[PDB]
Amino acid sequence: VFLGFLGAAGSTMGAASMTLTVQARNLLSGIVQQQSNLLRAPECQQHLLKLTVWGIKQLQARVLAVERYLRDQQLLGIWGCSGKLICCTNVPWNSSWSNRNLSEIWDNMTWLQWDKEISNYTQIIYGLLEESQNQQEKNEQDLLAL
């Protein structure tokens, strides 16, 4: 855990796609989330009760990490990707959002650069992914299929 947490950040999209579990494992487990799960009492705890302001700040940090995690999982569920780090969809690429070939982006760009190129199309793409899944379920409820 955290042995190369953002190690692929400067690498290409292709190479970086091979380290996806590395970042996923660090979204729900900060130091305080490890101390909170010791078999022994952590001892510190009395401090956070005697002084309730510190107790509240710690809980807010823990609750937020959980809420952010769950929201990303909910979107993957809605889009039809329950689990999987990499999933294919039926939404075609518009070639307006970005107009580059596969041999250019997977080999020459980093994920940070990509993110800064299509950031204002994010909501359009997410909207289409949701519509696609709804259409798929409508087709599933037809026993003659395709």
Partner: protein, 120 residues
């Protein structure tokens, strides 16, 4: 509620292609997937030929005719048709147009009267 009316040659010769059509009244064939052809052959009973999905144009055909039958639509005429290549005497049968609705909530069929086709 729809009505299905078949029409076509009542006689086809060996190695000729048989072409039958079906008009649909009361609803659209550009949608309502499940437009199909059924064959009733004396001595064998009923079998499917295949069906078409009006929304996408895709088709499925019973494997026995995988290399012999084409099903397609005329959505302007709101009719669909069946073509079977290399027709032989063994293909003499009563052919029917049918609409099969099968979903999670409803199940029903509509059948037309059919066309009897003699094959020499």
């Amino acid at each position: 509620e729809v009505q299905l009316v078949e029409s076509g040659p009542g006689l086809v010769r060996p190695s000729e292609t048989l072409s039958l059509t079906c008009a649909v009244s009361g609803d659209s064939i550009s949608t309502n997937n499940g437009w199909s052809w059924i064959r009733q052959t004396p001595g064998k009973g009923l079998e499917w030929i295949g069906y078409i999905n009006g929304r996408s144009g895709s088709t499925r055909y019973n494997p026995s005719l995988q290399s012999r039958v084409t099903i397609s639509t005329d959505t302007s005429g709101n009719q669909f048709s069946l073509k079977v290549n290399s027709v032989t005497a063994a293909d003499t049968a009563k052919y029917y147009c049918a609409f099969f609705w099968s979903t999670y909530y409803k199940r029903f069929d509509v059948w037309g009267p059919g066309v009897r086709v003699t094959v020499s």
